[PDB]
Amino acid sequence: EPEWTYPRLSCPGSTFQKALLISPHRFGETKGNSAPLIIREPFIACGPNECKHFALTHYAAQPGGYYNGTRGDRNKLRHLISVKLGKIPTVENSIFHMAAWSGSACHDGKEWTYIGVDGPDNNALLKVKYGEAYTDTYHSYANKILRTQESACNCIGGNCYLMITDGSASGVSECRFLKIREGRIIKEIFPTGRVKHTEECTCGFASNKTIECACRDNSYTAKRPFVKLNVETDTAEIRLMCTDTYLDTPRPNDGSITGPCESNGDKGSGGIKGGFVHQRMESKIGRWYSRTMSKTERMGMGLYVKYDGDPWADSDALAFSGVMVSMKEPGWYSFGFEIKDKKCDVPCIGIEMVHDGGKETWHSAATAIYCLMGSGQLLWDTVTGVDMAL
Amino acid sequence: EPEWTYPRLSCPGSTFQKALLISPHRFGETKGNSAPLIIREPFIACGPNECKHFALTHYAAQPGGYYNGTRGDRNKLRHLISVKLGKIPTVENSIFHMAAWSGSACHDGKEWTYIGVDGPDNNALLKVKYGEAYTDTYHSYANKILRTQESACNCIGGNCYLMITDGSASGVSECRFLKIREGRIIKEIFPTGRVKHTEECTCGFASNKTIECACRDNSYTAKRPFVKLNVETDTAEIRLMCTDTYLDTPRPNDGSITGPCESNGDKGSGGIKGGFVHQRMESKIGRWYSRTMSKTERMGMGLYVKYDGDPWADSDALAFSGVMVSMKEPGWYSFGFEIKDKKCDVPCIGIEMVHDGGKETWHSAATAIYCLMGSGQLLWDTVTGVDMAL
Amino acid sequence: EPEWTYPRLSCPGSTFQKALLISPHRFGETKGNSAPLIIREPFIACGPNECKHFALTHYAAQPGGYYNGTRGDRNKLRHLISVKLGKIPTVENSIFHMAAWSGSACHDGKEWTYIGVDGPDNNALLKVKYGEAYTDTYHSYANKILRTQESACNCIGGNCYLMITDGSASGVSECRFLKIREGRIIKEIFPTGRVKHTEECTCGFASNKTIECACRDNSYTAKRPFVKLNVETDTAEIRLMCTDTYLDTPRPNDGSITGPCESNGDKGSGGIKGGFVHQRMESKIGRWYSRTMSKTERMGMGLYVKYDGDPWADSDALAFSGVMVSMKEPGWYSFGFEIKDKKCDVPCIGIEMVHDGGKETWHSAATAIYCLMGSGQLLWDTVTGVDMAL
Amino acid sequence: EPEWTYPRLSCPGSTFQKALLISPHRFGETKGNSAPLIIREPFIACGPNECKHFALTHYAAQPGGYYNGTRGDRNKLRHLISVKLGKIPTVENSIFHMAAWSGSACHDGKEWTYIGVDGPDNNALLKVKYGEAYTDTYHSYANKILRTQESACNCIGGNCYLMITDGSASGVSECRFLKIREGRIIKEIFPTGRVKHTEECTCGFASNKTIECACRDNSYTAKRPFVKLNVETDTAEIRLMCTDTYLDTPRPNDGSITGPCESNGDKGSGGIKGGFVHQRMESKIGRWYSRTMSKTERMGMGLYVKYDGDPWADSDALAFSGVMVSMKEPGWYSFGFEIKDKKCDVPCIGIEMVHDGGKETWHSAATAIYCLMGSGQLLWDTVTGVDMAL
Ligand SMILES: *[C@@H]1O[C@H](CO)[C@@H](O[C@@H]2O[C@H](CO)[C@@H](O[C@@H]3O[C@H](CO[C@H]4O[C@H](CO)[C@@H](O)[C@H](O)[C@@H]4O)[C@@H](O)[C@H](O[C@H]4O[C@H](CO)[C@@H](O)[C@H](O)[C@@H]4O)[C@@H]3O)[C@H](O)[C@H]2NC(C)=O)[C@H](O)[C@H]1NC(C)=O
Ligand SMILES: *[C@@H]1O[C@H](CO)[C@@H](O[C@@H]2O[C@H](CO)[C@@H](O[C@@H]3O[C@H](CO[C@H]4O[C@H](CO)[C@@H](O)[C@H](O)[C@@H]4O)[C@@H](O)[C@H](O[C@H]4O[C@H](CO)[C@@H](O)[C@H](O)[C@@H]4O)[C@@H]3O)[C@H](O)[C@H]2NC(C)=O)[C@H](O)[C@H]1NC(C)=O
Ligand SMILES: *C1O[C@H](CO)[C@@H](O[C@@H]2O[C@H](CO)[C@@H](O[C@@H]3O[C@H](CO)[C@@H](O)[C@H](O)[C@@H]3O)[C@H](O)[C@H]2NC(C)=O)[C@H](O)[C@H]1NC(C)=O
Ligand SMILES: *C1O[C@H](CO)[C@@H](O[C@@H]2O[C@H](CO)[C@@H](O[C@@H]3O[C@H](CO)[C@@H](O)[C@H](O)[C@@H]3O)[C@H](O)[C@H]2NC(C)=O)[C@H](O)[C@H]1NC(C)=O
Ligand SMILES: CCC(CC)O[C@@H]1C=C(C(=O)O)C[C@H](N)[C@H]1NC(C)=O
Ligand SMILES: CCC(CC)O[C@@H]1C=C(C(=O)O)C[C@H](N)[C@H]1NC(C)=O
Ligand SMILES: CCC(CC)O[C@@H]1C=C(C(=O)O)C[C@H](N)[C@H]1NC(C)=O
Ligand SMILES: CCC(CC)O[C@@H]1C=C(C(=O)O)C[C@H](N)[C@H]1NC(C)=O
Ligand SMILES: *[C@@H]1O[C@H](CO)[C@@H](O)[C@H](O)[C@H]1NC(C)=O
Ligand SMILES: *[C@@H]1O[C@H](CO)[C@@H](O)[C@H](O)[C@H]1NC(C)=O
Ligand SMILES: *[C@H]1O[C@H](CO)[C@@H](O)[C@H](O)[C@H]1NC(C)=O
Ligand SMILES: *[C@H]1O[C@H](CO)[C@@H](O)[C@H](O)[C@H]1NC(C)=O
Ligand SMILES: [Ca+2]
Ligand SMILES: [Ca+2]
Ligand SMILES: [Ca+2]
Ligand SMILES: [Ca+2]
């Protein structure tokens, strides 16, 4: 019989390495006979036995004749799909969980919870599934596009925690946290602090008592807002990441934002979902982050790390760990997830690599995975190997 | 070991919402590489661990060369098929249960029961299959196209109840109920009351004591015949629904059929199978129905609910719960099924959205899913997104 | 924990009915995107939990460019493949058990045994697999094409019995029986009686003590040789089926072979594998057989039945049960198999329907299934629905 | 719960026979609708319930547009993949374990261990994965293409032994052995003796005490270096095989290398990985090897055996056990693996049959399987049946 699940100490290791590429569109050419789903916003969640690869499909394959509109975001056809990690997400392999143009998922130890937001922009609806059953919803509270993590949610003792948000992308977007248990919302958590704009949060456990998320401010700053959730007291505070190594895109030169830690600075309009995962140690806490190689475009992806301290107060640059994606390749969304080993947890970062040929062709993505493994320096970058002309 | 299942209290919730679209022909294009089966009359039936998506195929794929005939109903090629709900029903994903040009299925908590009618129009044969084995048959009794539900049948305590009917579709078709147990028919129940013409009943549990069916008079009325089946005494009775919200298609204007409740009215000729599903609470029962948005065409699909009362006597209009399919998309057969959550049941409605381009091109169908979830109003509607020309 | 398996009493029923068609080539057209394996000699075997559909593929799909040679029999590419019954045997769905141009399989209650013969004609080799492991072989003893049942073998108390044979197709072919236990040959059984030519035997249990097979004489008679295996004493006798209803193809007019029961008669050169399954009752034994509608070509397929008596001595015509395949459709190999219901066994007959366009096109087959179900007369025939020009 | 596995006595048997052909490119034609992966360096590794078929893909299918590069070895796209043995390794059937341009895997009785080396030629990285989790890494030690077995590694009592090597392939490559446990490297074993150049060892258990490896000197000899690894003391020693039946390709004429056993000889430059597998009896051990039928080209594959004796000292020619691939078909890499039967182990040899049409067309491979089964001589040989022009 299955127990609830808890964050365990991390596995030993001092560096990340290239783990695995999932590039479906290597098989999307017209010469071929394969049918990979057009997707975006991939993310991964692992339970005690499998890891699932999730995405939002446009309900189209390549090749096909429904490309037109695949470079949009919300519509009545977007679905949350998954396959077992390491399987190519195709028409036959994928499972379609629910209609949703925004999503999340997480395993509590007994069951999968699936999260999908759909509906009209002025009144969207967060839906929840526990296994195969629809169990609860949540309503827009700002009437300006309710949306969620695009990342794994996080469960502890059967309590699953989920960031949601609502409000103008180019203005105020106050996020809330949901406390979900066996598919049903049992508490809403309103953060305090710097709440102006928080979205597309990437959250993991820093401890058995705290969740941390690095988030996106699409409006005011290239600093990432940084949430701290206290799971023992069901309360949350958000302050900007003080680090000179600004993690959003677009962004100014590192350390060029003058003033106190909460200062917004410039080139802070727009943003990108960023990767963040915890290395939990006995007397240490490892914080691993990812950001675009370009300060302006979605190209390349870098790995950064900082042990200990307070991300709210420390202005120190993050340590640069290595190049995961070269600047000559697309570097879009990235996310954190952990694989459950037998006795310990393995932290990993995934990378969405979008094939963008403009609005006059199909628009989709591959997923690069990096994971904490062994000692040394990160050794090799990743390429999609896709030529969109085929 | 497993035990027999019984209807449970429904899960908490106040409105339906868009769950899931299964739209195989989104990958049905010449430009592509997939092979979705040409099907019609879909329905869903869920068990303690799996929900299954059934349909009647024509034993052809799109694209393919065997379109001719796919706009017909009965032939030697038709087979009851299924995929796990959420999977695209393609040549490879599908499983072929039996030859059938009319079907049903249901889980008793121990095993799947599958039901398929095939054979000549003047001597059809209902076949029962329990798991992998074929176990019993029922004979035509009117020699006018013996036929069954096209929706999930209903199992309580190992006993599965099923509507069957036989007769001219422009005249009399007195239906019967079969009591099946572990694949074998143990009692025929002959309903009393308004028996002139019943078919394509959508049935579900109103309690541990009563099964209710909303049906189709293809001959005499636009009101749906409404079966109450007492499961304790194995007796059944039919009267027409009194509600001014007439549920068949075609139909006249709401509340325009004058006279006592049993009055047939104008626009009786013709019909369509309608969604019906139960919401079982503490000491009240909600009844959820679906009808096409057009009075005469198979376009659109609206949701309606009515808590309590006797459906044989309540002239009251049903409450309009929302638009599931717009008047600009096809709305064909609809059906009710329930999903099993950990401790309670989730009431759902499925809509068949047929792609119809005439007898000179392929003729298949998508399936839209709406389920009780959360509170509020029903928000978004469903399109199939299919271009029948691609 | 699993027990060994034994023949149980049959399920009640007095007639066969059309159960299920598996016609992969409905999806083989060039307009399509599917890839069904080119196969022949299909057969089915069921264990306590699933039923597997077996065949010998030419290691080619349709469409493709390896048709040339698919109208042959033995080569270094022929394999024994299977899928779960009701699944279309395609390149992806099928599993490849072993190289073999002749085969058999059966479940003992704990495990699958697979049988495949390959090698050169003058020295072929019978191979055995127990689950995934190759466990034993058997050698040609006549150097003239060692070959086997093309049908399910039969297990009792963990002992699986298998017909094999060797020798000229147009001359003498003395069959032997193998006693196999957990993948290894533990006894060879040499029949006595009329041993001149016995091949492609279709065997089932007539009792907990006897196996009966109806076989093919390709050389001397259109009567089917009829084996009786005694499982309590590991001994076997073969005599010709005395019945006027000659079951082989080609064949003379019924009852036209004058003389004693063992008389060969004419039109007895050549032959066809014929279907045969037992209806085991308390005080009765049902023997169900199938034979071509044509007396000369492989067209149509008929169902016959006789209760009780001695098939060695009785000259009475078999009772005609109905037309399974019309004479306007191909009727090639047929076979018997039983599905295990919960408390009882269900007898069924399968029919190989070859698409034969000559040697200048592909050459493959679909499988029609009929099964004992309910009372009355067999109601409907089967068609492949395939146009080989597509 | 499961327990650790140990080598068991082999099953009874005296000769190998043709088991199974996996030839994906039989469905690789333009005329068709399949998508087999372009792979090379296959190998098999079996566990207590499943046997897995591994390969290194180039992340492309046939037909497809990414042929260019598929005749190379190392690039960022290469991934270790697998299907259950008997399944066609296509885009949909496959699972992508990790990025790797050199690989291995093995089961300890509790879990799969997967091994993949990727990275720059001058700083490769071996990655260890235990089930779903990445668990450890090993670094280049010569900065000359760290690389591993390309065959199953070897687990006894939870300890998995693996050969790795690093060095110029036209010079020195002193190999090492890694002792892995539950994904983690717990000891490096540095072999003594003839260490000049070892690589691509094919390893297997000779007893509960000793692992034996037949390897490849790509530089100095056509004799195979032969590792004896004592598993009790974790020490290893290498000397060359003395047998006149030299096993590398290219090679000179048998018994033409004159001198003591350690003598290198002519035609040392170049090499190929060879099949090697153990047959463990009461108190004797058979050693089965494979070598290409041509002295200089990668054509054909023959089987050889030698019961007992010391392979470091036995000048005796090995007994020729048969032709598996004719001199008219490709014979590339070969490898040994064992299948687990109920109470004993089944020794097997796998052959890589590469389809080579030059650097201007696709470059992939089939896999032939031979296993110990029954007695006699080895009968039939294997073709792949592929036309590289289709
Ligand atoms: C239609 O009819 C069926 C059959 O009667 C009803 O199903 C039963 O529903 C009741 C609840 O109404 C169930 O009783 C409960 O069982 C709980 C344990 O879960 C399992 O229990 C056994 C094994 O322990 C299993 O065999 C079974 O399948 C259950 O899944 C108990 O924990 C509960 O007891 C607690 O609750 C109350 C106080 O709140 C008290 O009884 C106790 O003091 C205790 O605190 C509870 O008794 C019963 O198990 C169900 N049986 C079956 C076969 O399903 C349907 O509810 C009914 N539908 C209606 C009425 O709409
Ligand atoms: C390499 O090393 C391993 C570990 O020592 C050996 O594996 C053992 O092999 C022996 C046989 O040589 C096994 O002993 C036998 O166990 C049988 C039962 O099967 C299971 O037993 C237990 C549970 O009962 C399980 O834990 C285990 O995994 C087995 O699968 C017994 O029935 C046998 O006993 C009978 O046989 C003889 C007489 O013939 C007597 O011992 C008894 O009187 C009795 O009649 C038998 O003892 C042992 O279980 C194996 N262990 C493991 C962990 O696998 C390998 O054989 C060895 N390889 C070599 C030597 O080549
Ligand atoms: C916070 O989450 C739980 C809080 O209890 C921690 O998990 C638990 O960890 C303990 C020990 O780490 C486990 O207890 C036992 O440990 C002994 C060794 O002393 C061992 O022999 C037993 O077999 C047993 O495992 C306990 O089972 C485990 N529970 C679960 C559900 O995992 C967790 O480590 C904490 N997270 C941290 C510290 O980051
Ligand atoms: C020949 O095969 C076996 C020979 O024993 C028969 O199967 C066995 O049948 C008996 C009864 O049919 C089963 O015993 C028990 O029956 C009682 C009822 O009296 C029931 O309450 C028990 O639960 C139990 O089932 C026995 O279990 C069963 N064994 C197996 C392995 O199936 C079989 O019926 C014979 N075949 C014939 C007669 O055709
Ligand atoms: C809706 C606001 C938000 C910020 C602009 O848009 C996101 C940015 C997009 C992006 O930056 O690539 C992709 C996301 N799919 C989108 N989210 C939704 C719900 O549409
Ligand atoms: C045969 C009577 C019945 C009522 C008109 O026909 C149904 C009409 C249906 C319809 O109105 O679309 C299609 C159904 N598939 C068909 N059922 C059968 C068994 O043919
Ligand atoms: C080899 C003798 C036998 C009788 C002519 O041939 C069978 C007849 C063929 C047939 O009658 O259709 C098909 C069988 N695949 C074949 N068996 C083998 C092993 O090739
Ligand atoms: C790099 C040294 C080694 C020996 C020549 O190369 C091998 C030659 C092999 C060969 O001879 O065909 C192909 C192997 N895939 C390759 N291995 C790697 C890691 O590239
Ligand atoms: C459809 O089939 C009928 C016969 O069944 C045939 O007469 C008709 O021409 C076919 N239609 C087309 C468009 O080919
Ligand atoms: C293969 O790729 C190289 C560059 O990587 C390119 O120069 C060459 O032309 C390509 N070959 C073909 C046949 O296109
Ligand atoms: C698709 O783009 C076309 C241009 O090809 C444009 O006319 C239209 O806005 C879009 N239509 C749909 C259905 O997406
Ligand atoms: C296939 O048939 C061709 C004719 O197209 C003939 O030349 C030859 O005998 C056959 N070849 C193979 C490889 O089967
Ligand atoms: Ca920003
Ligand atoms: Ca009507
Ligand atoms: Ca004959
Ligand atoms: Ca050499």
Author numbering:
A (entry chain B), B (entry chain A), C (entry chain B), D (entry chain A): 76 to 465
Paper text:
The NA active site includes catalytic residues (R118, D151, R152, R224, E276, R292, R371, and Y406; N2 numbering) that interact directly with the sialic acid substrate and framework residues (E119, R156, W178, S179, D/N198, I222, E227, H274, E277, N294, and E425; N2 numbering) that stabilize the active site. NAs are divided into 3 phylogenic groups: influenza B viruses, group 1 (N1, N4, N5, and N8), and group 2 (N2, N3, N6, N7, and N9) from influenza A viruses.
We used X-ray crystallography to understand the structural basis of resistance to oseltamivir conferred by NA carrying the I221L substitution. The structure of the NA-I221L-oseltamivir complex showed that the L side chain protrudes into the hydrophobic pocket of the active site that accommodates the pentyloxy substituent of oseltamivir, thus causing a change in the conformation of the inhibitor such that its C81 carbon moves about 2.2 Å from the wild-type NA bound position.
